[PDB]
Design a protein around this ligand. Sequence first.
Ligand SMILES: Cc1ccnc(-n2ccnc2)c1-c1cccc2c(CCCOc3cccc4ccccc34)c(C(=O)O)n(CC(=O)N3CCNCC3)c12
Ligand SMILES: [Zn+2]
Ligand SMILES: [Zn+2]
Length: 150
Amino acid sequence: SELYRQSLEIISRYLREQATGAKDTKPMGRSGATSRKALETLRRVGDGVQRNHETAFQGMLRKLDIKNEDDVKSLSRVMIHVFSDGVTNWGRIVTLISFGAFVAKHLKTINQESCIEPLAESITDVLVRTKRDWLVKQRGWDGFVEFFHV
Ligand SMILES: Cc1ccnc(-n2ccnc2)c1-c1cccc2c(CCCOc3cccc4ccccc34)c(C(=O)O)n(CC(=O)N3CCNCC3)c12
Ligand SMILES: [Zn+2]
Ligand SMILES: [Zn+2]
């Protein structure tokens, strides 16, 4: 669907920019203004989450103990568990994606950057496939952008 593809583009762009520090100039495409606004929202709100929850993020990264691609496969089990537990909302979705960026930065640091794209795919899979009903009900990325109104 466009929801999956839109979500993948936003999340992948955010993780790549976080990991590399570089901004992608290629147009978003279909939901341009909204996708661009969603990415900007992740930049601002996600920075806040990474900073304000740095202690937990650093501790979690240590727990995952990522050395290679095999460890990146193993964290998908943890991701789907922790995220699926309890009630979802945009705050938890930002935590999911912001932590993804935090992990992606680590992957850059250890020179295993090729895992960033599959990680973004994994995050998108868990978000869109498992919470489709909630996302649709809450107006998808339009809803996300309006909720935070950065
Ligand atoms: C597990 C944990 C324990 C204590 N404090 C935490 N933490 C994170 C920020 N502040 C605390 C967290 C915590 C750490 C990292 C992410 C989250 C999330 C988002 C969904 C899970 O995301 C991932 C898990 C594993 C690997 C991943 C790799 C890439 C991207 C995402 C990954 C949550 C959540 O869904 O709420 N939590 C739990 C959390 O925030 N809690 C705090 C209060 N008590 C336990 C629940 C994560
Ligand atoms: Zn926290
Ligand atoms: Zn806490």
